[model samples]
Target: MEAVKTDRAPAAIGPYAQAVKAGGFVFVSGQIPLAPDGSLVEGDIRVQTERVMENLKAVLEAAGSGLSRVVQTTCFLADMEDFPGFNEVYARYFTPPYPARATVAVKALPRGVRVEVACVALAE
Candidate 1:
């Protein structure tokens, strides 16, 4: 297995690598609404979702992959009611023939952020 590390994404708040690559796939860890500097991206669900996407984008790029190479994603939201706004932000990052995804509403997420996203992508 190969460990993926990148400065473009927020450093893990605890003990964890940003992502790990194994075989032909890269498994990115759940990304919260934190910037590279560990600051929370201030905004509502729409804005927080965008920030999470940006963080994922950076991690994927660092691993020599991109959103287009993503095969699947697992999303966590603090409130299910924000699904519509979240989908709008999500659509902008993924194109047609988009990757498979599962989004769930959870009681809470780390940092009390509205969204958290983790993904798996094909390695280059």
Candidate 2:
């Protein structure tokens, strides 16, 4: 396995690689709403989701993949009520057929952010 890294994404705040490339796929770690500089994004669910998508993109590109190559994604939301708001932003990032996704309401997420996303994508 090879680890992916890029200054375009926020540095992992814990002992985890941003993503790992193996067997023709890239497994991106869950991305929260922190900016590339590590500051927590301040906004509603839609805003936070946008930041998470950008972070995911950065990691995927670092792995030689992009959003169109995403195979699946798992999203965590601190509140299920934010689903609509989250989707509004998320829908703009990808096209049909969209990546298979599962968004679940979790007890919480890191940094008290409203959303976090992780994914797997085909890699070149």
Per-candidate alpha-carbon RMSD to the true structure: 0.8, 0.7
Show model 2 residue runs off by greater than 4 Å. Answer: none
Using lDDT, give the best candidate's number: 2
How well is each residue in 71-120 modelled by candidate 1, as lDDT tens digits? 99999999989899999999999987799999999999997899999999
lDDT per residue for candidate 2 within 24-55, as digits (tens), equals: 99999999998999989999998899999999
Residue 122 of model 2: what lDDT? Answer: 95
Question: For model 2, what is the alpha-carbon lDDT of residue 5?
Answer: 93
| Counted clashes in each candidate structure | 0, 0
